[PDB]
Write a protein that binds this ligand. Structure first.
Ligand SMILES: Cc1cc2nc3c(=O)[nH]c(=O)nc-3n(C[C@H](O)[C@H](O)[C@H](O)COP(=O)(O)OP(=O)(O)OC[C@H]3O[C@@H](n4cnc5c(N)ncnc54)[C@H](O)[C@@H]3O)c2cc1C
Ligand SMILES: Cc1cc2nc3c(=O)[nH]c(=O)nc-3n(C[C@H](O)[C@H](O)[C@H](O)COP(=O)(O)OP(=O)(O)OC[C@H]3O[C@@H](n4cnc5c(N)ncnc54)[C@H](O)[C@@H]3O)c2cc1C
Lengths: 461, 461
């Protein structure tokens, strides 16, 4: 079998399906729900996601679904992203349900089989492949299975993969409320750290606000106990110091679980997204880390089933993304550490605000919280023989790219790699780079080791 | 009489006494102990203390009692003080008992009456004076009383000044241990943050080490209970992961108390040092803040009893030093926030450690924990008509100084101020400054308001 089964059709699963579909791999996603769930948990995507979408032309399809914004924070300490030199993306306000719809439409348009209303009840693997049982008794078979089935992943559990980390005492609530004009909660728009905990209030409709509260190190009802509107109102009054009234729609709990799968791969079974790491939802790193799992994995998986992957390519998924996941965990825990009561962390918060005043600190934190590092390039304009283009347009094909910016290499000739010569530009501080299909820089002038890079990621030529 | 009574002859009381002695004020210090106590709680003084000692020639008297060192930390994150621009002081290693001996020696040489073996039992004031009673049944009378009587200050209590702040859960032990050669505790020399808490091991004699343990947010015996050696042995094995044995010379508890007097002045009664602020003992800010209390207060009190103090000059002691105390409080609390277990603060500690690699963060933190800001100058070499000097040498007489570095003002004529003309130097970023007797800049070119500054701090010309 040459088929990849994706367990779960959330944002990470759907992104992975898009990657595999672009690569031309036979792919099936099994998703329990008949549609993306509403209301959306998330209302924004960070620089990591924006860039990874752009290098596949996915942001254009989201153009009219939301808006660019250029704000960021570290544990609700305001940062200034537009002061940061370079050309890295900023953030984008859009409900995650809409992101999911665009991703699903893209995946289907690429030939991926999407099976909604299909519950996985059982997961097995043999030396010859992968087998999943659905709630209708059907067995679906493939070469590989990827658990993108969220925090509580059935795939992770059935694979025997431990999920270590912590479940802190935390009282977290959220919901959409229809409010009247003049509603006191409208005086608390934004995400802020108050004396006792966090409260975020955001307009999501002409008469509607999303309200989120979170208080650390305090008792909380169990996560599947019903949330009465009076509980949310009491939290808002206690934390935000304002009276909430209105007509509640959605009301639910959320947790401060911070856990990561001990390994991202077990034979023919792999993990991505929330199944692989469940982190505190801050600044878009939670989804961002999952989306970048998907992009890291897609092309490696494809190369593997198509027969041209170097022996160790698929193992580099766990190696790179478990490290990246641990760094995301570290960043988000560093943040939640100072989201305790101000009686306990107020002074350190004020110190950090002061430090964030220093240009290098602001740049450091904006990049960290956006999930941005020097492993990928910015989407910079380029001029080639075929005219004007840019770095990320070269990556839309989903193929490796040797981009020569004046280093003047003899044209690299590898069946998996596209050689592109472009005029020099000051906006990239390398005269040549080798880009993996996920956009990651595998080599750059003037480093030695170009052939080893080529062979490591694409095989010999 | 017109006598200043100082309650307490610790480092802060004795420094205050030296300041008053320099200014020619009749002064008595009442101190419970027959001699500075051993063992010393502290073994180093920070940049603030070194500078304030230097501007009175006191470091000279200490030159053979210890040694300069150039290390610093923020909650045991190592810093690099020598990378910092300026001519600001570093640290000095010396037991505090010896500092006390030198300060008392200086105070006596200036004619201060130092009465040891004296228990103060009650303190009172009348419109015309202060009255303090001793355990032997005598009354000491004066014009002003200053409480330098430590953390448990009787003077603070009897003046009815509240001591708000916090007393975190904290298990702190310390003592001096005579150990056998090859003792495993010598494998842990230094002040370090471990998994569970902090431990400092410091050689203090050929076969004697000081050992200090501290663990936050765990149960502990009350601070007045006795320490058995077994308790310290367990703490060291638990925290530092090493076996301690030997013969203890002294064992006691210490707390993470962080409190500050609501006001530093109540009529003719004032507070300084630990009586004014009890902070976490870390990096030298605990003593440093007190020493600068003493230097701030001395000349102002002198001006008050000599009749040349403007009406609100003594009040400025509370305004400045309370503010400075609050900042020290905020600083040290910031630090203790990340001295919890690494299971709770490890990621934030690692992040901060990375940020401290940025030059401006390193500078910010070194200056902060050294108590150093822009309110005083460095001790820079100067060239005057009378030959070579330095900034602090001009401050040893304890008078205000109008230091003209090429601004070429007409000679300032003020009975409390010395006008000094020096050649330009690149090591001071002003062409002229007005220095208060505590070394603090009251005015600098090209600011307006030289006359106003003169009148504010030194009265009418
Ligand atoms: C309250 C809250 C607010 C948040 N806000 C943000 C934000 O603003 N920005 C941000 O970036 N992130 C945010 N996050 C985090 C973000 O929602 C997740 O990181 C993201 O949804 C992870 O995507 P995923 O596809 O891995 O998992 P999911 O979105 O959970 O998708 C997993 C899918 O698998 C399906 N599934 C599960 N089990 C089975 C089964 N047995 N058979 C078939 N299908 C199955 C589920 O139906 C689901 O569709 C927030 C999270 C919470 C809780
Ligand atoms: C374990 C420990 C380690 C420390 N380490 C450091 C360090 O490394 N660096 C640092 O800078 N700081 C350190 N400190 C803090 C430092 O010791 C204090 O900040 C400093 O001693 C304050 O000086 P002070 O003169 O205000 O009070 P004290 O030093 O407490 O002096 C007060 C004096 O008043 C006398 N007194 C009190 N009541 C009466 C009374 N009724 N009658 C007569 N006399 C009285 C006492 O005998 C005492 O001599 C440490 C503290 C502790 C507990």
């Amino acid at each position: 079998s040459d088929t990849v089964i994706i367990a779960g059709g959330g944002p990470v699963g759907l992104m992975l399906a898009c990657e595999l579909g672009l690569a031309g791999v036979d792919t099936v996603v099994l998703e329990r729900h008949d549609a993306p769930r509403e209301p959306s948990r998330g209302g924004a995507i960070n620089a990591t996601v924006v860039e990874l979408f752009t290098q596949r032309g996915i942001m254009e399809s989201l153009r009219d679904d939301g808006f660019e914004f250029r704000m960021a924070h570290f544990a609700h300490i305001p940062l200034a992203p537009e002061r940061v030199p370079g050309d890295r993306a900023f953030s984008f306000a859009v409900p995650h349900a809409q992101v999911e719809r665009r991703l699903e439409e893209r995946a289907r348009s690429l030939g991926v089989r999407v099976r909604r209303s299909t519950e996985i009840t059982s997961v097995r693997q043999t030396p010859d492949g992968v087998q999943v049982t659905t709630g209708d008794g059907e067995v679906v078979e493939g070469a590989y299975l990827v658990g993108c089935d969220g925090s509580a992943s059935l795939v992770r559990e059935q694979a025997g993969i431990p999920f270590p980390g912590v479940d802190p005492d935390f009282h977290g609530l959220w919901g959409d409320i229809k409010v009247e004009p003049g509603a006191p909660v409208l005086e608390r728009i934004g995400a802020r750290q108050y004396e006792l905990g966090l409260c975020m209030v955001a307009p999501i409709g002409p008469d509607t606000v999303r309200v989120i509260t979170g208080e650390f190190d305090v008792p909380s009802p169990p996560a599947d106990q019903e949330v009465g509107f009076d509980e949310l109102r009491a939290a808002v009054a206690r934390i935000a110091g304002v009276e909430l009234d209105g007509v509640p729609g959605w009301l639910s709990r959320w947790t401060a679980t911070s856990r990561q799968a001990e390994r991202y791969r077990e034979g023919r079974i792999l993990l991505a997204g929330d199944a692989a790491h469940t982190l505190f939802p801050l600044g878009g790193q939670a989804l961002g880390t999952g989306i970048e799992d998907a992009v890291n994995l897609g092309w490696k998986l494809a190369a593997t089933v198509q027969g041209w992957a170097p022996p160790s390519l698929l193992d580099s998924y766990h190696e790179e993304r478990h490290a990246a996941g641990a760094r995301a965990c570290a960043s988000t825990r560093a943040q939640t550490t100072i989201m305790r009561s101000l009686a306990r962390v107020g002074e350190l918060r004020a110190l950090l605000t002061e430090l964030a005043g220093l240009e290098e600190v602001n740049a450091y934190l904006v990049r960290m919280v956006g999930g941005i590092d020097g492993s990928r390039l910015p989407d910079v304009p380029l001029v080639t023989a075929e005219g004007e283009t840019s770095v990320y347009r070269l990556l839309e094909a989903g193929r490796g790219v040797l981009l020569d910016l004046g280093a003047g290499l003899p044209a690299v000739r590898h069946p998996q790699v596209t050689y592109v010569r472009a005029e020099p530009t000051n906006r990239l501080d390398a005269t040549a780079v080798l880009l993996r299909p996920d956009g990651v820089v595998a080599w750059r002038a003037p480093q030695d080791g170009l052939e080893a890079a080529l062979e490591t990621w694409f095989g010999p030529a």
